[PDB]
């Protein structure tokens, strides 16, 4: 009778007169008291007070009516627990008539509730603020200073942190703080047009510290690292190479510029969680995260590429050739083993089956933990073999030679692992491999379908009896049908009139189709159809060569000794600041473009 | 692409075709919703993200997202 | 303007059907073409005309072949205003209830709008969906 009235008159707002009156009427029947008006005024099933459900309906008036509520709840003193007020409902608890006057755009209600004592650290925890299954929902964080950030509102923003009670530093139920939050929903430029970078430079600059960038969330992750989870780039850039001009807030930077001399100048990169001297970093990250798919733009980052090389310069090189040399030898000396069948056995063998114990026992270790993987498989397989011929040779069986031939074969199958050390052949051998994938399999599907079909179809014509004259009928069983089908395909089967086969015309139509289908249509389509994805994998395969390499060169870090693998320790000791040292990565850059005076710089004297 | 979903359509369809009745009644895609004082109409709700362009939404159906 | 000259007139009959059976719909559909020739004039003609006479006579009538110019508009070829057609959303609140694309509930910019499956569906004899898919013309 009396709430409806209410709710409907914010509701509609066309009307301020009978909210004016209807209000009058509230407060003469409040004679019988605070907690009463709240109970009246306060949807009960939802908790939804009327000042929610009159900033949902944003009307011309909208304003006025919020004003009029207010004063009507301070001159009863409610005030205080009619905008804090918030909603029990599962789904949407937590929030509050402030996240509504952000989520709706609204800069003067929100600086109203704001100075009206409206609690602006306020955690949103509904099913609906934290979805699962993120088609419907929006996790913009729990926070409001998070809302108006993720929804892009610079001025609210400005406002939330100028207010002095406002905790730039809290975490929400998941963890995260503001920064996380600005990297779960950052996206790409061509969907956001790249706001939320400002957002995140608008935040640190505003709050000096490392105390943001720090934190962990509840998976345990910096929003630097949680970046490299996600598949965030062109946040991960920013973060990434950080230029800070202010010299006040210039310890926040994470790239300086040690010397600059005209255009010529070195540039200075901090490794501090980059750099894998860490458990988990950035680069192990981008590197062994298969669930981006985003990792080419990532390792062509500014210091993942250098780290990359002088690795690479320094040891990853020896390590990968010297494993070349240790298996090329190991298949020579199967090959030799292999082929002639006194002292020959007794050296070579033992070294055989030492080395190919080696790689089944590395690789099954490795396969322990899990397309790109593929030849792990490879050579685990090949190094069962190889045992396993050991074991039926020194037992008394026939079946030796078997797997040790194919056990051979297969490794000079795996010599091609080895061409991913060289830049020419290795996008060759990642041309191939997508070319396995994309093209090839679909040509020998349909060619097998067809080697079984006109394998019963011939053989059924043939089958008449050979009359005890095996040259007479060509065709046995339904193997010999499709042997002599495949042998046509290469030019050796013989094709003729056939006795034997009562249906000669039918015979010969029906096999002048085979050769129609396989070659002038379905061989020439599997060259035309490459021939479309080369043009496609050339642009990118040598990013993809670049990420095989890098997953090598880490596993060879990961495979050095403590004190050896401190040894190198890529970068320097740089003092940045009056108490900071960190580790940094130099590099040299010149550029002709943009000419300035040289102001923030680490030396005077360029070396 | 475009040419194999025109396929894979009819195909649908066909298929749709060849249900009883009630079977066919029993799928009935979409949902009763009312968009306005007497109109009540099957709709089909489809989820968007459009980080582009801002405003604040007045003309919606239901004040709660659900 | 002439257009707006003639609809302001209280003499004409806007629902009218020639010889044909089309009204005033059906003929903008049996006209418009593409973008890169009329750049589109007509899904505005279009528009203007529905709101200028709010109800669903127009839209629900049928000429001489039995048809919607909604219908129509699957029978021939014509995409740029059957999109159109297909997706309205009338800001206005009071011709509000003449749109077939809603939004149900919007929130930061997550949305979930929703669609209007009347003539579409393929509950109906003939519909927007059958057509466009058995339509080998």
Not at 37 to 53: E, I, N, P, R, V
Not at 428 to 442: A, F, G, N
Request: with cysteine; charged share 20%.
């Amino acid at each position: 009778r009396l709430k409806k009235r209410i709710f409907a008159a914010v509701s509609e707002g066309c009307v301020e007169e009978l909210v004016e009156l209807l209000v009058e009427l509230q407060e003469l029947c409040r004679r019988r008291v605070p907690d009463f008006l709240m109970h009246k005024l306060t949807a009960s099933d939802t908790g939804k007070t009327c000042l929610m459900k009159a900033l949902l309906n944003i009307n011309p008036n909208t304003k006025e009516i919020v004003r009029i509520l207010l004063a009507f709840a301070e001159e009863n003193d409610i005030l205080g627990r009619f905008i804090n007020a918030e909603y029990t409902e599962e789904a949407y608890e937590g929030q509050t008539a402030l996240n509504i006057a952000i989520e709706r755009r609204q800069g003067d209600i929100a600086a109203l509730l704001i100075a009206a004592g409206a609690d602006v650290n306020a955690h949103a925890k509904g099913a609906f603020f934290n979805p699962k299954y993120q088609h419907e929902g929006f996790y913009f964080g729990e926070t409001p200073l998070a809302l108006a950030a993720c929804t892009n509102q610079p001025e609210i923003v400005q406002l939330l942190m100028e207010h002095e009670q406002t905790d730039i530093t809290s975490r929400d139920s998941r963890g995260n703080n503001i920064l996380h939050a600005l990297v779960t929903v950052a996206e790409d430029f061509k969907t956001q047009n790249d706001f939320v970078k400002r957002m995140y430079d608008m935040i640190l600059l505003r709050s000096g510290n490392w105390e943001l960038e720090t934190t962990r969330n509840n998976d345990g992750l910096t929003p630097l690292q949680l970046a490299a989870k996600m598949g965030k780039a062109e946040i991960l850039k920013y973060i990434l190479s950080r230029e800070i001009k202010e010299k006040r807030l210039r310890s926040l930077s994470r790239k300086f510029t040690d010397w600059a001399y005209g255009p010529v100048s070195s540039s200075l990169y901090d490794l501090t969680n980059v750099d894998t001297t860490t458990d988990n970093s950035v680069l192990e990250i981008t590197v062994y995260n298969t669930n981006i798919d985003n990792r080419h733009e990532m390792l062509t980052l500014e210091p993942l590429h250098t780290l990359l090389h002088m690795k690479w310069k320094k040891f990853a090189k020896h390590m990968f050739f010297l494993s070349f040399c240790f298996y090329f030898f190991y298949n020579i000396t199967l090959t030799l083993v292999s082929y002639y069948r006194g002292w020959l056995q007794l050296l070579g063998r033992m070294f055989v089956l030492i080395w190919a114990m080696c790689i089944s026992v590395k690789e099954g270790i490795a396969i322990f933990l899990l397309s790109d993987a593929w030849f792990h498989f490879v050579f685990f397989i090949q190094a069962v073999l190889v045992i396993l011929s050991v074991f039926l040779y020194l037992f008394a069986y026939k079946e030796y030679l078997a797997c040790l031939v194919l056990a051979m074969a297969l490794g000079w199958a795996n010599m091609l692992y080895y061409t991913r050390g060289f830049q020419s052949m290795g996008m060759y051998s990642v041309m191939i491999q997508k070319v396995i994938l994309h093209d090839v399999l679909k040509f020998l599907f349909v060619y097998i379908v067809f080697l079984l079909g006109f394998g019963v179809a011939l053989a059924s014509l043939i089958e008449k009896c050979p009359k005890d004259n095996k040259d007479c009928s060509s065709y046995g069983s339904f193997s010999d049908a499709v042997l002599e089908l495949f042998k046509l395909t290469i030019g050796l089967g013989d094709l003729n009139i056939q006795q034997n086969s009562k249906y000669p015309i039918l015979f010969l139509f029906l096999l002048i189709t085979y050769v129609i289908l396989t070659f002038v249509l379905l061989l020439n389509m599997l060259i035309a159809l490459m021939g479309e994805t080369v043009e496609n994998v050339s642009k990118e395969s040598e990013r993809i060569w670049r990420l095989q390499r890098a997953r090598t060169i880490l596993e060879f870090e990961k495979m050095l000794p403590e004190w050896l693998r401190s040894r190198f320790r890529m970068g320097e000791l740089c003092k940045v600041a009056e108490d900071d040292f960190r580790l940094c990565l130099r590099i040299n850059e010149v550029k002709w473009t943009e000419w300035k005076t040289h102001v923030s710089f680490l030396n005077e004297d360029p070396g």
